[PDB]
């Protein structure tokens, strides 16, 4: 009953050999695609409140936060631009928690490249746009840094249809 194909990514616009994008709720997408790796839009504390992190923790019924607290016991906090690889719970095999700069927190956008660098540790990832949404970066600029930095394969989920349509236009 238990084994199903992983990384079943469909319905995406292929931007480059490394980056594809879809207008979809990332939790619903993880459920469909059965990814090996989902990326969380983490903060250094791995306290999963708000935005994508809140959504992923909610989908795990708090299991992600429990595990994350054990990781903080082990490691202490992350740094901006850093990451850790933990369980993906019911969303994915693994979750790569990646800390992008939060512009709304006064952090430096130049750290967004380092944040995306972390994706290169994994062959295929389902991810949000780092530093976008509540973290305050312009999503088109985050996508730009993504395309410039990620050398593996990332499937980007965005929630905003108007953003997706602008990406298509910038593609056309």
JSON list of C-alpha atoms in Angstrom, two decimals:
[
{"chain": "A", "resi": 1, "resn": "UNK", "atom": "CA", "xyz": [0.00, 0.00, 0.00]},
{"chain": "A", "resi": 2, "resn": "UNK", "atom": "CA", "xyz": [2.71, 2.38, 1.09]},
{"chain": "A", "resi": 3, "resn": "UNK", "atom": "CA", "xyz": [5.23, 3.03, -1.71]},
{"chain": "A", "resi": 4, "resn": "UNK", "atom": "CA", "xyz": [4.37, 5.71, -4.36]},
{"chain": "A", "resi": 5, "resn": "UNK", "atom": "CA", "xyz": [6.53, 7.58, -6.95]},
{"chain": "A", "resi": 6, "resn": "UNK", "atom": "CA", "xyz": [8.31, 10.62, -5.59]},
{"chain": "A", "resi": 7, "resn": "UNK", "atom": "CA", "xyz": [8.81, 13.99, -7.23]},
{"chain": "A", "resi": 8, "resn": "UNK", "atom": "CA", "xyz": [5.64, 13.96, -9.33]},
{"chain": "A", "resi": 9, "resn": "UNK", "atom": "CA", "xyz": [5.85, 17.53, -10.53]},
{"chain": "A", "resi": 10, "resn": "UNK", "atom": "CA", "xyz": [3.33, 18.51, -13.19]},
{"chain": "A", "resi": 11, "resn": "UNK", "atom": "CA", "xyz": [1.60, 21.68, -14.36]},
{"chain": "A", "resi": 12, "resn": "UNK", "atom": "CA", "xyz": [4.70, 23.85, -14.17]},
{"chain": "A", "resi": 13, "resn": "UNK", "atom": "CA", "xyz": [6.08, 26.56, -16.43]},
{"chain": "A", "resi": 14, "resn": "UNK", "atom": "CA", "xyz": [9.73, 25.77, -17.14]},
{"chain": "A", "resi": 15, "resn": "UNK", "atom": "CA", "xyz": [11.73, 28.97, -16.85]},
{"chain": "A", "resi": 16, "resn": "UNK", "atom": "CA", "xyz": [15.27, 27.54, -17.20]},
{"chain": "A", "resi": 17, "resn": "UNK", "atom": "CA", "xyz": [16.89, 24.09, -16.98]},
{"chain": "A", "resi": 18, "resn": "UNK", "atom": "CA", "xyz": [16.99, 24.56, -13.16]},
{"chain": "A", "resi": 19, "resn": "UNK", "atom": "CA", "xyz": [13.76, 26.42, -12.29]},
{"chain": "A", "resi": 20, "resn": "UNK", "atom": "CA", "xyz": [10.07, 25.78, -12.93]},
{"chain": "A", "resi": 21, "resn": "UNK", "atom": "CA", "xyz": [7.09, 27.62, -11.42]},
{"chain": "A", "resi": 22, "resn": "UNK", "atom": "CA", "xyz": [3.42, 26.95, -10.66]},
{"chain": "A", "resi": 23, "resn": "UNK", "atom": "CA", "xyz": [0.57, 28.91, -9.07]},
{"chain": "A", "resi": 24, "resn": "UNK", "atom": "CA", "xyz": [-0.41, 26.50, -6.31]},
{"chain": "A", "resi": 25, "resn": "UNK", "atom": "CA", "xyz": [-0.69, 26.25, -2.50]},
{"chain": "A", "resi": 26, "resn": "UNK", "atom": "CA", "xyz": [2.61, 24.62, -1.44]},
{"chain": "A", "resi": 27, "resn": "UNK", "atom": "CA", "xyz": [0.98, 22.27, 1.08]},
{"chain": "A", "resi": 28, "resn": "UNK", "atom": "CA", "xyz": [-1.48, 21.00, -1.52]},
{"chain": "A", "resi": 29, "resn": "UNK", "atom": "CA", "xyz": [1.36, 20.65, -3.96]},
{"chain": "A", "resi": 30, "resn": "UNK", "atom": "CA", "xyz": [3.50, 18.64, -1.54]},
{"chain": "A", "resi": 31, "resn": "UNK", "atom": "CA", "xyz": [0.55, 16.30, -1.00]},
{"chain": "A", "resi": 32, "resn": "UNK", "atom": "CA", "xyz": [0.19, 15.76, -4.72]},
{"chain": "A", "resi": 33, "resn": "UNK", "atom": "CA", "xyz": [3.85, 15.64, -5.76]},
{"chain": "A", "resi": 34, "resn": "UNK", "atom": "CA", "xyz": [5.29, 13.54, -2.98]},
{"chain": "A", "resi": 35, "resn": "UNK", "atom": "CA", "xyz": [8.57, 15.43, -2.96]},
{"chain": "A", "resi": 36, "resn": "UNK", "atom": "CA", "xyz": [11.85, 14.14, -1.65]},
{"chain": "A", "resi": 37, "resn": "UNK", "atom": "CA", "xyz": [12.57, 17.67, -0.33]},
{"chain": "A", "resi": 38, "resn": "UNK", "atom": "CA", "xyz": [10.31, 20.58, 0.63]},
{"chain": "A", "resi": 39, "resn": "UNK", "atom": "CA", "xyz": [11.86, 23.92, 1.52]},
{"chain": "A", "resi": 40, "resn": "UNK", "atom": "CA", "xyz": [10.60, 25.87, 4.48]},
{"chain": "A", "resi": 41, "resn": "UNK", "atom": "CA", "xyz": [10.87, 29.62, 4.68]},
{"chain": "A", "resi": 42, "resn": "UNK", "atom": "CA", "xyz": [12.42, 29.46, 8.12]},
{"chain": "A", "resi": 43, "resn": "UNK", "atom": "CA", "xyz": [13.72, 31.95, 10.62]},
{"chain": "A", "resi": 44, "resn": "UNK", "atom": "CA", "xyz": [16.87, 31.46, 12.67]},
{"chain": "A", "resi": 45, "resn": "UNK", "atom": "CA", "xyz": [14.86, 30.28, 15.68]},
{"chain": "A", "resi": 46, "resn": "UNK", "atom": "CA", "xyz": [12.95, 27.63, 13.71]},
{"chain": "A", "resi": 47, "resn": "UNK", "atom": "CA", "xyz": [9.80, 29.05, 15.32]},
{"chain": "A", "resi": 48, "resn": "UNK", "atom": "CA", "xyz": [7.21, 28.28, 12.64]},
{"chain": "A", "resi": 49, "resn": "UNK", "atom": "CA", "xyz": [4.69, 31.07, 12.98]},
{"chain": "A", "resi": 50, "resn": "UNK", "atom": "CA", "xyz": [3.36, 32.92, 9.95]},
{"chain": "A", "resi": 51, "resn": "UNK", "atom": "CA", "xyz": [3.70, 32.60, 6.24]},
{"chain": "A", "resi": 52, "resn": "UNK", "atom": "CA", "xyz": [4.90, 29.38, 4.68]},
{"chain": "A", "resi": 53, "resn": "UNK", "atom": "CA", "xyz": [6.45, 28.12, 7.95]},
{"chain": "A", "resi": 54, "resn": "UNK", "atom": "CA", "xyz": [3.16, 28.36, 9.77]},
{"chain": "A", "resi": 55, "resn": "UNK", "atom": "CA", "xyz": [1.42, 26.59, 7.00]},
{"chain": "A", "resi": 56, "resn": "UNK", "atom": "CA", "xyz": [3.90, 23.71, 6.91]},
{"chain": "A", "resi": 57, "resn": "UNK", "atom": "CA", "xyz": [3.87, 23.29, 10.70]},
{"chain": "A", "resi": 58, "resn": "UNK", "atom": "CA", "xyz": [0.07, 23.38, 10.70]},
{"chain": "A", "resi": 59, "resn": "UNK", "atom": "CA", "xyz": [-0.03, 20.68, 8.06]},
{"chain": "A", "resi": 60, "resn": "UNK", "atom": "CA", "xyz": [2.16, 18.50, 10.33]},
{"chain": "A", "resi": 61, "resn": "UNK", "atom": "CA", "xyz": [-0.14, 19.17, 13.35]},
{"chain": "A", "resi": 62, "resn": "UNK", "atom": "CA", "xyz": [2.82, 20.63, 15.25]},
{"chain": "A", "resi": 63, "resn": "UNK", "atom": "CA", "xyz": [5.22, 17.76, 14.65]},
{"chain": "A", "resi": 64, "resn": "UNK", "atom": "CA", "xyz": [7.57, 19.99, 12.69]},
{"chain": "A", "resi": 65, "resn": "UNK", "atom": "CA", "xyz": [7.81, 22.46, 15.57]},
{"chain": "A", "resi": 66, "resn": "UNK", "atom": "CA", "xyz": [8.53, 19.67, 18.08]},
{"chain": "A", "resi": 67, "resn": "UNK", "atom": "CA", "xyz": [11.34, 18.35, 15.93]},
{"chain": "A", "resi": 68, "resn": "UNK", "atom": "CA", "xyz": [12.65, 21.85, 15.29]},
{"chain": "A", "resi": 69, "resn": "UNK", "atom": "CA", "xyz": [12.87, 22.52, 19.03]},
{"chain": "A", "resi": 70, "resn": "UNK", "atom": "CA", "xyz": [15.06, 19.40, 19.34]},
{"chain": "A", "resi": 71, "resn": "UNK", "atom": "CA", "xyz": [17.28, 20.75, 16.57]},
{"chain": "A", "resi": 72, "resn": "UNK", "atom": "CA", "xyz": [17.64, 24.08, 18.34]},
{"chain": "A", "resi": 73, "resn": "UNK", "atom": "CA", "xyz": [18.66, 22.17, 21.50]},
{"chain": "A", "resi": 74, "resn": "UNK", "atom": "CA", "xyz": [21.30, 20.41, 19.48]},
{"chain": "A", "resi": 75, "resn": "UNK", "atom": "CA", "xyz": [22.59, 23.27, 17.32]},
{"chain": "A", "resi": 76, "resn": "UNK", "atom": "CA", "xyz": [21.43, 26.57, 18.61]},
{"chain": "A", "resi": 77, "resn": "UNK", "atom": "CA", "xyz": [19.90, 29.03, 16.21]},
{"chain": "A", "resi": 78, "resn": "UNK", "atom": "CA", "xyz": [20.67, 29.13, 12.50]},
{"chain": "A", "resi": 79, "resn": "UNK", "atom": "CA", "xyz": [22.14, 32.13, 10.74]},
{"chain": "A", "resi": 80, "resn": "UNK", "atom": "CA", "xyz": [20.61, 34.18, 7.96]},
{"chain": "A", "resi": 81, "resn": "UNK", "atom": "CA", "xyz": [21.63, 32.52, 4.71]},
{"chain": "A", "resi": 82, "resn": "UNK", "atom": "CA", "xyz": [21.91, 29.16, 6.43]},
{"chain": "A", "resi": 83, "resn": "UNK", "atom": "CA", "xyz": [19.90, 25.96, 6.53]},
{"chain": "A", "resi": 84, "resn": "UNK", "atom": "CA", "xyz": [19.28, 22.64, 8.17]},
{"chain": "A", "resi": 85, "resn": "UNK", "atom": "CA", "xyz": [17.85, 19.43, 6.80]},
{"chain": "A", "resi": 86, "resn": "UNK", "atom": "CA", "xyz": [15.20, 17.81, 8.98]},
{"chain": "A", "resi": 87, "resn": "UNK", "atom": "CA", "xyz": [12.24, 15.47, 8.54]},
{"chain": "A", "resi": 88, "resn": "UNK", "atom": "CA", "xyz": [9.56, 16.36, 5.99]},
{"chain": "A", "resi": 89, "resn": "UNK", "atom": "CA", "xyz": [6.92, 14.67, 8.08]},
{"chain": "A", "resi": 90, "resn": "UNK", "atom": "CA", "xyz": [3.74, 14.12, 6.06]},
{"chain": "A", "resi": 91, "resn": "UNK", "atom": "CA", "xyz": [4.76, 16.70, 3.45]},
{"chain": "A", "resi": 92, "resn": "UNK", "atom": "CA", "xyz": [7.99, 15.26, 2.03]},
{"chain": "A", "resi": 93, "resn": "UNK", "atom": "CA", "xyz": [10.79, 12.88, 2.90]},
{"chain": "A", "resi": 94, "resn": "UNK", "atom": "CA", "xyz": [12.97, 15.78, 4.13]},
{"chain": "A", "resi": 95, "resn": "UNK", "atom": "CA", "xyz": [12.47, 19.49, 4.86]},
{"chain": "A", "resi": 96, "resn": "UNK", "atom": "CA", "xyz": [15.30, 21.88, 4.09]},
{"chain": "A", "resi": 97, "resn": "UNK", "atom": "CA", "xyz": [14.70, 24.82, 6.42]},
{"chain": "A", "resi": 98, "resn": "UNK", "atom": "CA", "xyz": [16.31, 27.82, 4.73]},
{"chain": "A", "resi": 99, "resn": "UNK", "atom": "CA", "xyz": [16.62, 31.27, 6.33]},
{"chain": "A", "resi": 100, "resn": "UNK", "atom": "CA", "xyz": [16.33, 34.09, 3.81]},
{"chain": "A", "resi": 101, "resn": "UNK", "atom": "CA", "xyz": [16.83, 37.66, 4.95]},
{"chain": "A", "resi": 102, "resn": "UNK", "atom": "CA", "xyz": [13.67, 39.33, 6.27]},
{"chain": "A", "resi": 103, "resn": "UNK", "atom": "CA", "xyz": [13.63, 42.79, 4.81]},
{"chain": "A", "resi": 104, "resn": "UNK", "atom": "CA", "xyz": [10.76, 43.74, 7.04]},
{"chain": "A", "resi": 105, "resn": "UNK", "atom": "CA", "xyz": [13.20, 42.93, 9.90]},
{"chain": "A", "resi": 106, "resn": "UNK", "atom": "CA", "xyz": [15.93, 45.15, 8.47]},
{"chain": "A", "resi": 107, "resn": "UNK", "atom": "CA", "xyz": [18.07, 42.32, 7.17]},
{"chain": "A", "resi": 108, "resn": "UNK", "atom": "CA", "xyz": [20.24, 42.57, 4.05]},
{"chain": "A", "resi": 109, "resn": "UNK", "atom": "CA", "xyz": [18.86, 41.39, 0.70]},
{"chain": "A", "resi": 110, "resn": "UNK", "atom": "CA", "xyz": [22.33, 40.44, -0.42]},
{"chain": "A", "resi": 111, "resn": "UNK", "atom": "CA", "xyz": [22.05, 37.39, 1.89]},
{"chain": "A", "resi": 112, "resn": "UNK", "atom": "CA", "xyz": [19.33, 36.04, -0.42]},
{"chain": "A", "resi": 113, "resn": "UNK", "atom": "CA", "xyz": [21.98, 34.53, -2.71]},
{"chain": "A", "resi": 114, "resn": "UNK", "atom": "CA", "xyz": [23.50, 32.59, 0.18]},
{"chain": "A", "resi": 115, "resn": "UNK", "atom": "CA", "xyz": [20.07, 31.44, 1.19]},
{"chain": "A", "resi": 116, "resn": "UNK", "atom": "CA", "xyz": [19.37, 30.05, -2.31]},
{"chain": "A", "resi": 117, "resn": "UNK", "atom": "CA", "xyz": [22.85, 28.46, -2.42]},
{"chain": "A", "resi": 118, "resn": "UNK", "atom": "CA", "xyz": [21.55, 25.94, 0.13]},
{"chain": "A", "resi": 119, "resn": "UNK", "atom": "CA", "xyz": [19.24, 24.49, -2.54]},
{"chain": "A", "resi": 120, "resn": "UNK", "atom": "CA", "xyz": [22.31, 23.19, -4.37]},
{"chain": "A", "resi": 121, "resn": "UNK", "atom": "CA", "xyz": [22.79, 20.54, -1.68]},
{"chain": "A", "resi": 122, "resn": "UNK", "atom": "CA", "xyz": [19.71, 18.68, -3.01]},
{"chain": "A", "resi": 123, "resn": "UNK", "atom": "CA", "xyz": [18.92, 17.39, -6.52]},
{"chain": "A", "resi": 124, "resn": "UNK", "atom": "CA", "xyz": [15.24, 18.29, -6.59]},
{"chain": "A", "resi": 125, "resn": "UNK", "atom": "CA", "xyz": [13.26, 20.61, -4.27]},
{"chain": "A", "resi": 126, "resn": "UNK", "atom": "CA", "xyz": [9.74, 21.94, -3.94]},
{"chain": "A", "resi": 127, "resn": "UNK", "atom": "CA", "xyz": [10.05, 25.52, -2.64]},
{"chain": "A", "resi": 128, "resn": "UNK", "atom": "CA", "xyz": [8.50, 28.91, -2.08]},
{"chain": "A", "resi": 129, "resn": "UNK", "atom": "CA", "xyz": [10.22, 32.10, -3.20]},
{"chain": "A", "resi": 130, "resn": "UNK", "atom": "CA", "xyz": [12.68, 32.87, -0.41]},
{"chain": "A", "resi": 131, "resn": "UNK", "atom": "CA", "xyz": [12.36, 36.19, 1.39]},
{"chain": "A", "resi": 132, "resn": "UNK", "atom": "CA", "xyz": [9.08, 36.95, -0.38]},
{"chain": "A", "resi": 133, "resn": "UNK", "atom": "CA", "xyz": [5.66, 37.27, 1.24]},
{"chain": "A", "resi": 134, "resn": "UNK", "atom": "CA", "xyz": [5.93, 38.35, 4.81]},
{"chain": "A", "resi": 135, "resn": "UNK", "atom": "CA", "xyz": [9.74, 38.58, 4.58]},
{"chain": "A", "resi": 136, "resn": "UNK", "atom": "CA", "xyz": [9.32, 41.66, 2.39]},
{"chain": "A", "resi": 137, "resn": "UNK", "atom": "CA", "xyz": [11.37, 41.07, -0.78]},
{"chain": "A", "resi": 138, "resn": "UNK", "atom": "CA", "xyz": [9.87, 41.66, -4.14]},
{"chain": "A", "resi": 139, "resn": "UNK", "atom": "CA", "xyz": [8.92, 38.20, -5.43]},
{"chain": "A", "resi": 140, "resn": "UNK", "atom": "CA", "xyz": [10.21, 38.94, -8.92]},
{"chain": "A", "resi": 141, "resn": "UNK", "atom": "CA", "xyz": [13.59, 39.83, -7.50]},
{"chain": "A", "resi": 142, "resn": "UNK", "atom": "CA", "xyz": [13.63, 36.65, -5.39]},
{"chain": "A", "resi": 143, "resn": "UNK", "atom": "CA", "xyz": [12.82, 34.65, -8.53]},
{"chain": "A", "resi": 144, "resn": "UNK", "atom": "CA", "xyz": [15.68, 36.41, -10.29]},
{"chain": "A", "resi": 145, "resn": "UNK", "atom": "CA", "xyz": [18.16, 35.42, -7.57]},
{"chain": "A", "resi": 146, "resn": "UNK", "atom": "CA", "xyz": [16.76, 31.89, -7.64]},
{"chain": "A", "resi": 147, "resn": "UNK", "atom": "CA", "xyz": [17.39, 31.55, -11.40]},
{"chain": "A", "resi": 148, "resn": "UNK", "atom": "CA", "xyz": [20.85, 33.05, -11.01]},
{"chain": "A", "resi": 149, "resn": "UNK", "atom": "CA", "xyz": [21.85, 30.84, -8.11]},
{"chain": "A", "resi": 150, "resn": "UNK", "atom": "CA", "xyz": [20.18, 27.40, -8.15]},
{"chain": "A", "resi": 151, "resn": "UNK", "atom": "CA", "xyz": [22.04, 24.85, -10.27]},
{"chain": "A", "resi": 152, "resn": "UNK", "atom": "CA", "xyz": [20.02, 21.80, -9.30]},
{"chain": "A", "resi": 153, "resn": "UNK", "atom": "CA", "xyz": [16.21, 21.54, -9.97]},
{"chain": "A", "resi": 154, "resn": "UNK", "atom": "CA", "xyz": [13.65, 23.57, -8.08]},
{"chain": "A", "resi": 155, "resn": "UNK", "atom": "CA", "xyz": [9.94, 23.62, -8.46]},
{"chain": "A", "resi": 156, "resn": "UNK", "atom": "CA", "xyz": [8.63, 26.94, -7.14]},
{"chain": "A", "resi": 157, "resn": "UNK", "atom": "CA", "xyz": [5.12, 27.28, -5.76]},
{"chain": "A", "resi": 158, "resn": "UNK", "atom": "CA", "xyz": [3.62, 30.72, -5.61]},
{"chain": "A", "resi": 159, "resn": "UNK", "atom": "CA", "xyz": [0.20, 31.55, -4.11]},
{"chain": "A", "resi": 160, "resn": "UNK", "atom": "CA", "xyz": [-0.53, 34.79, -5.98]},
{"chain": "A", "resi": 161, "resn": "UNK", "atom": "CA", "xyz": [-2.12, 34.28, -9.44]},
{"chain": "A", "resi": 162, "resn": "UNK", "atom": "CA", "xyz": [-1.31, 37.88, -10.43]},
{"chain": "A", "resi": 163, "resn": "UNK", "atom": "CA", "xyz": [2.35, 37.29, -9.66]},
{"chain": "A", "resi": 164, "resn": "UNK", "atom": "CA", "xyz": [2.31, 34.07, -11.71]},
{"chain": "A", "resi": 165, "resn": "UNK", "atom": "CA", "xyz": [0.78, 35.91, -14.66]},
{"chain": "A", "resi": 166, "resn": "UNK", "atom": "CA", "xyz": [3.54, 38.57, -14.45]},
{"chain": "A", "resi": 167, "resn": "UNK", "atom": "CA", "xyz": [6.18, 35.79, -14.46]},
{"chain": "A", "resi": 168, "resn": "UNK", "atom": "CA", "xyz": [4.58, 34.39, -17.63]},
{"chain": "A", "resi": 169, "resn": "UNK", "atom": "CA", "xyz": [4.69, 37.85, -19.25]},
{"chain": "A", "resi": 170, "resn": "UNK", "atom": "CA", "xyz": [8.32, 38.35, -18.26]},
{"chain": "A", "resi": 171, "resn": "UNK", "atom": "CA", "xyz": [8.90, 34.89, -19.77]},
{"chain": "A", "resi": 172, "resn": "UNK", "atom": "CA", "xyz": [7.02, 35.92, -22.99]}
]
